[PDB]
């Protein structure tokens, strides 16, 4: 089935992971209205070695959670978080070697940013086993660098399909909360259409401006879409760019959707 | 057909387009290194409205090869350059309504450093026909977005494909010049080859860590592939990107190349 579809995690052996997210669920325009000042996305980006200090991967994954993943509540944030925690499969208590969190969180109402910024004062820099500290820090921006795909797939139950056209643009938003405001919210609204005034002028916009005139044969020839809106976050140094392994893409699959069966 | 292919945008009806480049060229790394003055990638984003001013298309064409493209010599440049017109389809004249010019060049040389110094110094701020000034900006940077598809194509001499995998990676260099250095000539050698230990390592440092594997299969069951390097260009001020319409991508034509008739 279409719609959001999250690309899958980093696969790794003698490596248990937590993976944490409320991305997939569509963003709530009449909650985000709620968010007055616009705030940096948050990052966390770290890792350390654990060889020698005697943890157990459940000693590792829980603390990170009491610290970190249970601080972030789905009822106040959009969050993807990714914990990962590596052992060593010849040691006779398979103590963790290492461990990782990749996060990326926003908040979303003006309520959130009060409660988050108490938690940063009580656990930004906390000491993650007197081998390294959490670490949140602010994205400076993000670049998002999206892909669009129109074709005729004969099965949709297999990735496989014919390409008849692919377009890429770009675009600088403040936050990932901005993202999920202005272009995730249109994907749903008009991505997602049969109407040739919803979905046509929606090219417009992000793809080009007047890719509806080009796209109207296309789209009338084609039965499935997709858009890769890679995240590409700016952080303060120059130079320092920080892309997630925590990526979707839409999948809009025009035969099953449409009386026509096919995207107009 | 094959190697490098200019890819801009549907031409918009009533423009006409000139088109300069020598990016097509393969990189030399000898010369390249003789290059000991970093210097960052110069820009033109210059546009204006020219409706009334009774300019031929060929009067704007021609007064912009004057002061631009003809100063910026192929042999000490390497440069893409894009000059459109909008014309008035109805007047019995066809007069220029506006007009746009959208270039990056890079110099090759010390000598072409101390030439583009003598050229800002006399034609930056050049008045383009009292509606606005030729601009030559310095990006800070540039973020390259690389897209790779792989697939089956049955016929060479049409655009459509049968697409098996898409995979997106993200870059940060100083300047096309280092892009061209580093990226660019990479793909040249190892890229286009069915050589195993050329381009799957190429994957493995370009695509992801160990892409080599996955796309060994693919690469058999494949034989067409495209490398779509975006260049997002950095500029000075924060939030300011620009990505032209001078948009290149590398076709690789496995089922002509190849006694496989495949990409290996």
Same mark, same amino acid.
């Given at each position: 089935?279409?719609?959001l579809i999250?690309?899958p995690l /980093? !696969? *790794?052996?003698? +490596?248990?992971?937590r993976?944490?997210?409320n991305?997939?669920?569509?963003?709530n325009?009449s !909650?985000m @209205?709620q968010?007055?000042i616009?705030? /940096?996305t948050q990052i966390?980006?770290?890792?350390?070695n654990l060889?020698g200090?005697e943890?157990?991967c459940d000693?590792?994954?829980?603390?990170?959670?009491?610290?970190?993943?249970?601080?972030?509540s789905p009822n106040?944030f959009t969050?993807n978080?990714y914990?990962?925690?590596?052992?060593?499969?010849?040691?006779?208590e398979?103590?963790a070697? *290492?461990?990782?969190?990749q996060?990326?969180?926003?908040?979303?109402?003006?309520?959130a940013?009060?409660?988050?910024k108490s938690?940063?004062k009580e656990?930004n820099?906390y000491?993650?086993?007197?081998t +390294?500290?959490? !670490?949140?820090? *602010?994205a400076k921006?993000?670049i998002?660098?999206?892909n669009l795909? @129109?074709?005729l797939?004969s099965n949709?139950d297999?990735? /496989?399909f014919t390409? =008849?056209?692919q377009?890429?643009?770009?675009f600088?938003?403040?936050s990932?909360?901005?993202?999920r405001k202005?272009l995730?919210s249109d994907i749903?609204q008009?991505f =997602?259409?049969?109407? /040739?005034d919803?979905?046509?002028?929606?090219?417009?916009?992000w793809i080009?401006?007047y890719a509806?005139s080009v796209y109207?044969?296309?789209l009338m020839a084609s039965?499935?879409?997709?858009? !890769?809106p890679?995240?590409i976050?700016?952080?303060?140094?120059?130079?320092?760019?920080?892309?997630?392994?925590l990526?979707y893409?839409?999948?809009?699959l025009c035969?099953?959707?449409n009386?026509?069966?096919?995207?107009?």
């Amino acid at each position: 089935t279409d719609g959001l579809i999250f690309s899958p995690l /980093p !696969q *790794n052996k003698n +490596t248990v992971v937590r993976h944490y997210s409320n991305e997939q669920e569509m963003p709530n325009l009449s !909650q985000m @209205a709620q968010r007055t000042i616009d705030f /940096p996305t948050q990052i966390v980006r770290v890792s350390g070695n654990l060889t020698g200090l005697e943890l157990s991967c459940d000693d590792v994954e829980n603390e990170i959670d009491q610290v970190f993943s249970k601080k972030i509540s789905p009822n106040l944030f959009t969050y993807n978080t990714y914990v990962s925690c590596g052992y060593d499969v010849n040691d006779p208590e398979q103590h963790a070697i *290492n461990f990782s969190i990749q996060s990326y969180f926003d908040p979303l109402t003006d309520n959130a940013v009060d409660y988050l910024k108490s938690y940063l004062k009580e656990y930004n820099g906390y000491n993650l086993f007197n081998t +390294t500290t959490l !670490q949140i820090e *602010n994205a400076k921006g993000i670049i998002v660098s999206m892909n669009l795909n @129109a074709g005729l797939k004969s099965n949709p139950d297999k990735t /496989p399909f014919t390409l =008849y056209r692919q377009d890429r643009n770009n675009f600088y938003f403040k936050s990932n909360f901005d993202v999920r405001k202005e272009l995730i919210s249109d994907i749903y609204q008009r991505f =997602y259409s049969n109407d /040739p005034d919803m979905i046509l002028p929606f090219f417009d916009k992000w793809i080009f401006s007047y890719a509806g005139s080009v796209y109207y044969s296309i789209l009338m020839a084609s039965n499935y879409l997709e858009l !890769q809106p890679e995240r590409i976050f700016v952080m303060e140094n120059e130079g320092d760019i920080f892309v997630s392994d925590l990526r979707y893409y839409f999948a809009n699959l025009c035969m099953k959707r449409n009386p026509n069966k096919h995207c107009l």
